[PDB]
Write a protein that binds this ligand. Structure first.
Ligand SMILES: [Cu+2]
Length: 623
């Protein structure tokens, strides 16, 4: 049995005694001591000091740089007073065992985390966040598996499920194991399961991911460096693909105009040497090595050497089977699969590498690519505020790079999604790239508007999303930010007791952007796609669907479904549409070119002229 507090929980006379002493564990609350939080797990109190009002949350700490620590304070009340009497104090911590009052330092210059700890109590002056300007975050969704890699499951009438996976363990990784821990999350229902995927003899940690024409996910290399699994949404099963011609890890793959998948680099797993290109043909079910797809031009310069330098290429499938490589190498390049592969310089993005910077094609029709953040070395490297729009016209002809306004924060290991209005939301990352750390995690998301060419700071998330964190678009036009952490351990099935569990975030949180709210902070009225054919459509063809619940003519956009890991999302892409409406009936002529309309499963978003999007309808583009 479990004796709940007047919301704590032990597992009945010593219990009341134990819940007096802030040092007493041997306690069995929902989340354990150490757990990060979005909301007081316990019953909050209010408290005024002869002025103008603090909310207190017991058994919770605020971690981070303090403005002050004062040792002579025996009551939460006296701690409330030092905060009341200290300029720019939004957040203080009362230490129960030592009678000290910590004043937290100013946000967001400082990163402050809400952890669960019975030794402390948190005090704060309530924030007034207008979700019409800064969006709104929900509470931490706990998950059986750290979501180190994630992808939407293509489904009709719209997707409902987010698969994610880690390694052999739910919170740890080794080398070759032949098994992968997967999490299943229905976000239509909140249902959540995990499975163990051994049937393909594949530890899929550190892989290339690309969605095929038929919406199967192609999971390539990683801890088992030469091994390929294919996920069929149709079966919800995995299949063994043909081994790659060259074993790789931390590489990028991208689906091409013709539905072949190109990949290059991936020196993390297999031979510690740079990796030339290869291409998967799903019809022939065959990989073909591409020696002329030379790695050396796309090489970064890293203090750790070649191990790092060909990792996480900014690849895009483009016109007539071309590949654009936007980075993170200071120079951009065009890669092809013709003959034995090709490579040529396209432009210079910057004067330094941006390993694990963010990058998204926010307007395929206009050949437009947005890139921000990254660090010049993989780890132990200060991140950059620099950001660029890169415009690509014809393949194997120079590309145009315009530097734009610096981000508000330097971000290493951040993630990015394009939204239906074509704005790009950057989430997570840290001031200095340090693998397996919460250190200087930026909590404040930022929205970049390519039309304004201007940044805007969004509301803060709860948890630092650094290395092994992820971000992805959901059908409802919200963003899931999740994971971070994992522990290297020598052999498979070794104990994870020595691991720093504070860096692990086996969970996620969802952001509603500004566009989901009216000015009064109520949820704005989403257009509804009443009817759409589940029929696959081909490029150049005309999409017809029925929209109800809009004042004026809707705009529309297609956003290709997303796969994501290691600041790499090579499947997402925004294809803005021109619509013509006759009454409730909307009609769109899709582009002529599969280099813009990459084949696969898309989200159709109709959105109001004030910019409020529909829940999406699944749309399948075929060859
Ligand atoms: Cu990694």
């Amino acid at each position: 049995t479990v004796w709940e507090t007047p919301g704590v929980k032990y597992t009945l006379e010593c219990a009341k005694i134990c819940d007096s002493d802030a040092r007493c564990n041997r306690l069995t609350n929902d989340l354990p001591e150490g757990a990060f939080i979005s909301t007081c797990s316990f019953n909050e109190t209010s408290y005024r000091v002869p002025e103008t009002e603090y909310r207190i949350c017991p058994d919770t700490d605020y971690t981070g740089v303090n403005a002050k620590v004062v040792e002579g304070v025996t009551t939460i009340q006296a701690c409330a007073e030092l905060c009341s009497n200290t300029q720019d104090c939004r957040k203080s911590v009362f230490d129960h065992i030592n009678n000290a009052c910590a004043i937290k330092a100013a946000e967001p210059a400082t990163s402050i985390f809400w952890v669960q700890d019975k030794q402390f109590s948190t005090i704060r002056l309530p924030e007034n966040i207008d979700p019409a300007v800064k969006g709104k975050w929900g509470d931490l969704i706990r998950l059986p598996v750290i979501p180190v890699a994630a992808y939407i499951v293509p489904s009709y009438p719209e997707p409902s499920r987010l698969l994610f996976f880690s390694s052999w363990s739910n919170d740890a990784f080794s080398g070759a194991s032949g098994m992968t821990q997967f999490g299943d999350y229905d976000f239509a229902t909140g249902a959540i399961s995990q499975r163990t995927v051994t049937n393909t003899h594949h530890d899929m940690f550190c892989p290339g991911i690309s969605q095929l024409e038929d919406g199967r996910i192609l999971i390539q290399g990683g801890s088992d460096a030469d091994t390929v699994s294919i996920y069929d949404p149709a079966t919800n099963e995995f299949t063994r693909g043909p081994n790659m011609t060259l074993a790789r890890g931390y590489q990028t793959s991208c689906t091409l105009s013709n539905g072949k998948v190109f990949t290059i680099g991936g020196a993390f797993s297999g031979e510690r040497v740079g990796k030339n290109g290869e291409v998967y043909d799903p019809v022939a079910n065959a990989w073909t090595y591409l020696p002329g797809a030379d790695f050396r031009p796309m090489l970064t310069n890293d203090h750790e050497g070649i191990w790092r330098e060909d990792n996480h290429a900014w690849l895009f499938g483009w016109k007539n089977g071309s590949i654009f490589q936007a980075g993170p190498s200071k120079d951009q390049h065009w890669y092809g699969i013709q003959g034995n592969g090709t490579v040529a310089k396209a432009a210079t993005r910057d004067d330094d590498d941006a390993m694990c910077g963010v990058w998204v094609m926010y307007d395929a029709v206009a050949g437009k690519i947005f890139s921000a953040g990254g660090s010049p070395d993989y780890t132990d490297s200060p991140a950059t505020q620099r950001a660029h729009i890169t415009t690509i016209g014809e393949p194997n002809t120079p590309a145009e790079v315009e530097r734009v306004a610096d981000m508000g924060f330097p971000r290493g290991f951040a993630n990015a999604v394009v939204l239906p209005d074509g704005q790009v939301l950057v989430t997570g990352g840290q001031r200095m790239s340090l693998v397996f750390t919460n250190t200087d995690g930026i909590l404040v998301a930022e929205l970049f508007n390519p039309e304004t060419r201007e940044w805007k700071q969004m509301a803060p998330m709860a948890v630092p999303r650094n290395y092994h964190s992820v971000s992805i678009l959901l059908p409802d036009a919200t963003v899931f930010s999740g994971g971070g952490g994992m522990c290297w351990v020598q052999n498979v099935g070794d104990s994870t007791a020595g691991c720093d569990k504070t860096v692990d975030h086996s969970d996620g949180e969802i952001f509603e952007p500004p566009y989901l709210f009216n000015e009064d902070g109520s949820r704005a009225a989403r257009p509804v796609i009443s009817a759409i054919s589940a029929d696959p459509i081909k490029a150049g063809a005309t999409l017809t669907f029925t929209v109800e619940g809009v004042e004026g003519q809707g705009t529309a956009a297609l956003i290709r479904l997303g796969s994501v890991t290691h600041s790499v999302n090579s499947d997402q892409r925004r294809v803005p549409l021109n619509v013509t409406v006759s009454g409730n009936e909307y009609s769109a002529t899709l582009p002529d070119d599969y280099g813009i309309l990459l084949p696969g499963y898309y989200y159709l978003f109709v959105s109001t002229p004030q910019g409020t999007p529909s829940i999406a309808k699944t749309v399948h583009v075929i060859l």
